[PDB]
Amino acid sequence: QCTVRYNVADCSHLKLTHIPDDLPSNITVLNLTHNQLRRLPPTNFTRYSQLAILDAGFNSISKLEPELCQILPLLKVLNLQHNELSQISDQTFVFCTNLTELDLMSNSIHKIKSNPFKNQKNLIKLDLSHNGLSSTKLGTGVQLENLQELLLAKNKILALRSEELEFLGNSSLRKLDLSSNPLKEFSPGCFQTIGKLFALLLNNAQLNPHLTEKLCWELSNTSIQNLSLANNQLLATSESTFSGLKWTNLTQLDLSYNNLHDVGNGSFSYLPSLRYLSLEYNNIQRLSPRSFYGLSNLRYLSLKRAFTKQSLASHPNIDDFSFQWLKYLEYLNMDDNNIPSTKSNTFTGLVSLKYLSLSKTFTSLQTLTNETFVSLAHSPLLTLNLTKNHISKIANGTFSWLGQLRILDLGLNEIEQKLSGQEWRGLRNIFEIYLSYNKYLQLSTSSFALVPSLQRLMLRRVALKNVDISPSPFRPLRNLTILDLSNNNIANINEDLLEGLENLEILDFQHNNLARLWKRANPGGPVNFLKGLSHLHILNLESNGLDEIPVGVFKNLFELKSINLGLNNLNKLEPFIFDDQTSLRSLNLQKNLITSVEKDVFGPPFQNLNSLDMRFNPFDCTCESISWFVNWINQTHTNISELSTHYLCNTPHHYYGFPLKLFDTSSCK
Amino acid sequence: QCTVRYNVADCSHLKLTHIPDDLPSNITVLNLTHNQLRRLPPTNFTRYSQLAILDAGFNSISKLEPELCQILPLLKVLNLQHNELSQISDQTFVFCTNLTELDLMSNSIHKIKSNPFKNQKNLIKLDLSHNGLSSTKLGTGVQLENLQELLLAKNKILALRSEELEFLGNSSLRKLDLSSNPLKEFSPGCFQTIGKLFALLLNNAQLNPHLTEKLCWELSNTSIQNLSLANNQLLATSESTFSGLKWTNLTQLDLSYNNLHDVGNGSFSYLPSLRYLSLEYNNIQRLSPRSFYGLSNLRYLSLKRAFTKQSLASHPNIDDFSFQWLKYLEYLNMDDNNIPSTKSNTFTGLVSLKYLSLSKTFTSLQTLTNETFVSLAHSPLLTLNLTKNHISKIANGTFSWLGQLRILDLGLNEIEQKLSGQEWRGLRNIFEIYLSYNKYLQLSTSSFALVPSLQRLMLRRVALKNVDISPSPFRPLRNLTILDLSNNNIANINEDLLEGLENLEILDFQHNNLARLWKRANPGGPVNFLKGLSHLHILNLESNGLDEIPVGVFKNLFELKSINLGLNNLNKLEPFIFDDQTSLRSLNLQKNLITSVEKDVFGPPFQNLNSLDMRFNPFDCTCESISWFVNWINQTHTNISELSTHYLCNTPHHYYGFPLKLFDTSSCK
RNA sequence: UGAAGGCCUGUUUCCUAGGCUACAUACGAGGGACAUGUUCCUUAGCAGUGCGACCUGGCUCGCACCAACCACACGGGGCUCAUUCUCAGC
LRRNT domain spans which residues (chains A, B)? Predict the structure, then answer.
């Protein structure tokens, strides 16, 4: 049966052979996609006279009658995607006068000859793609007043002349796609005849660096602002290539996937207003300083995988002062490249750059010296992503130049050293230091003395050592909020740790073998860890070997919202272990060994809990153990996932596997 | 209090100040070792007149009265070790006439001047060591008729002359130790004056390539049979060194720890009757063929660590035909050496050898070719130990020469290959192949086709792969009894495996992740492993991930004696799982998750059990689960280790951590 | 006096055989989101597209198991010092 919902009956994957006419008569939307339909009888739309749009696609619909839309004058969107409409006639639409969006995706309409769209005056979107068209002309008169998207994708247009374009005289083509159409020639004036042409999409149209030169002149004196040229054969460019754009104001230009091998001297000198430029996925050999000459307004450059693979000692290389022209650049991306290493004047000139990414860019950057980032002295950087570079060591003061740096990322590297606090010399105001997934990070007493402004500090899977030294290396980080120490196998710690971080909110301790610290039989008592940092919200102690939470290591943590103590080994919980957690919102105690869940322990937190999770525990179906629990279950509104399936008793001998919430407690208490 | 036992009152570590005289008067032995005693009052031994021997050592005993032994005429062994008897006089023993063993180990009896031993006529053992003696003479008359062990260890004898020896004229000295005594000269006739001198022990006496040549002549025409020269400075030997032994019948000669650097040509040419020779712990450079010339009767040679460490390209080396003279040798040991590898004619000549060891002997033996053991063609080998040689691959037919080989050992190696059955070509009648602790052993269908005579086959920790192929690679091993497959992480196996091994007795499967095979929810049912091989005695399935033993995978195994299912995850046991185990003798189910031990399951095996072990399980202290168990406990004679401590409960909420045995089942059943 | 010893008492060192711990890593199963290579299945008897699906893969990513890994806590086996209780020879 179809899913009737608030006047939008969506009938998807219903195998409907013929259009059903069911109850709802106020429906405004109807989905027919993914159904085998012969065709649409124009008369079954009398019980359905209110539909504003109808999604009728992915059905083998032979043909269409003008009745369907003219018996339904209130029509806005008619989706007719992938249906088989081999031919079309103006009659079909002579009545249709309210539609604004006409979708035709795969219909074998190959040839049209009529003036079918003299009636659509409100038609904005007009998708005519993959239909085997051999010419673009769709009429003889000046029609389609307000048409803002004209797609012609994967058709067989071979050329563009002003004769097959004239029917758009006063329209404003906000997006004219022509992707994958094997164009070979653009008749002069085949673009001057469109009213207002903003965008363009020549993807996959197999262009040559010569055709381009011509197309440019045919785009001159036009109002084009976006222009894409992805998936072409622009093996190289010269100053004469884009010469035709000089009379234009081109905002964004894309050149990804062109196997572009050479970027001639002064090839961009004629785009003094370009504000975005994507060079992704090209095999660029090198960049002379005069390469980018002209782009005095560029604001976003992407070089992701834009350089040839490393050869043969023919690795790609950029020369000094190569960016001295982009005095306005503010986002430079250079991922996935093989550039050897940085030079003293590589980034010289960028006096406005603020987001720089170099993830997986260098190959010989094993060691970061104090002279690597000298180029970025005058650049107000606010971000530096250095993931996946095989960095193996950071020399002293290497970041002294990045004064205003805020978000720094050195994760997924091979750093194996002993932090001595000097590595951060100069990071006046640093926000967060994502430093996870490294080889070895021996800590010292002053490792973080120089950066007292940290907010987030990730140390996931860095094989930490020397974390019990006193005082805590985290002592000077007073503004710290988010701290992560998972997957480190932290043998032991002193309670001195975390002293004074009154702002710590999120704390992670997954996989850290913290068993002994909380056992009652310690050298000198269980570690009253988590002391007086009231502001903690989310606490994580998953899979920590934990065996016993000693009474009152959760004191004064009133604002704590989410405890996650699952995957440990907990059987006996001493009363009042949770007493200040009166605002707890989500508890997780799965895969533990908890046999009994009494009221003196979980009472206070279960009060206003929101989502509990204690699946897979060996629950004990007796009345002096789970009675109160089963009752709470019956009378709660706390989302408890898989209550019927994964909650089950494993004792008594004759209750092994019995549904937890079925144990009748009505005969006790 | 002293431990009185069957007339042997042993008072060890009792802090006894003065000799107590308690009830037992039939005691024949009395231990006094490790007690601080001033001395032994000869009059407190009137209540104790029956002792035959008294172990009175490790006590600071000033002196001894002749009364103690003469009031006890029936005395056989008087041990007086480590006591402080600065002086002694004949009077002490003029009465003593029944003692047979007198022990004096560390007493500062530096000088003696008397005939103190004219009375001991039955004294066999006479230990006089570490006593600061400056001469060996212990009397002037021909005494000590039957004396068969005269120790003088760690004293300060400087020479041996026939004057200080004459008091043994007609005695037969079966062992004359002179260890650690810094001897400098052996006056002529210092050995011809003893009646029958068989053994000798000159350990640690700091000899030289000189002194030896002379001592030999002083030992000539004597009846010596054993001779030790360990811990000396024989830096090299020549044919003239042992020349003095030619007139003797020398059975065993030891030369260990002599830093022996060169063994000159014909150094042993004068010992045509030596039958044991230990060259252990020496720095021998090389062995010419003429090295062992003469030893035509040797029957046991030891070269354990007898070759210099590997240099500097100056590694030790053995030449061809170096053993051509030892045509009677029958046990050659060559452990802990650095010889590069075997040559075509290394072992040529040994036509009687039957035990050969080469553990940790070679350095460049990564690959064993079919021409390595060509030397052993005519040697009836019955053992070949090759552990710890870093062997990495076995070529085809490498053992074709060792026809009569029975016990072969290739363990603790780096073998990483795929057995194709050819590696055993020629092992007509092989007994066992210890092949554990290797890198990788891919198995094939014919791996053991050529050796159908195996008895024991160890494959411990070899990371086996391809063990589920059909037919079983163990199919032709019909006489197989002991099979080991532990620590291999065997993912899965087909039931075809072990088909026809009706003689298999011991089977090991520790640590092999065999969980799913026995689960009821298999592709086509649980694998009826261990099918119809009734003769299995000891079955081991420890730590195997096991989760459920399906009913009747233990059918017809009547003679199975010991099941070991510890370190698994077993909670429910379906009735009748053990039914044919009516002769089971020892069960092991520790560290499981067994909550209930009922009667229908463990009944039949618990009948005649001998030793049970089910510690660390989460037992359920309720009456419909453990009642019968607690009862059985009260009414059994089955050795149950740690019954009081490691058999506790986990349910109900009370009775938690409660000792099992103290659970009163008198109010139910 | 010094020197020498049994005797204990504690330490420390060092190993070896443990159990227990957690971590990375790996071999497996069984999962959920794919676009695929073909298989059905109908649509314009065929070709082309367009109701879902199955089999095979390249998997990403959570899960249970087991193995070896190294880390952590604690026993357990040798040795080497302590300062006492008592000798003699002087």
Answer: 1-25
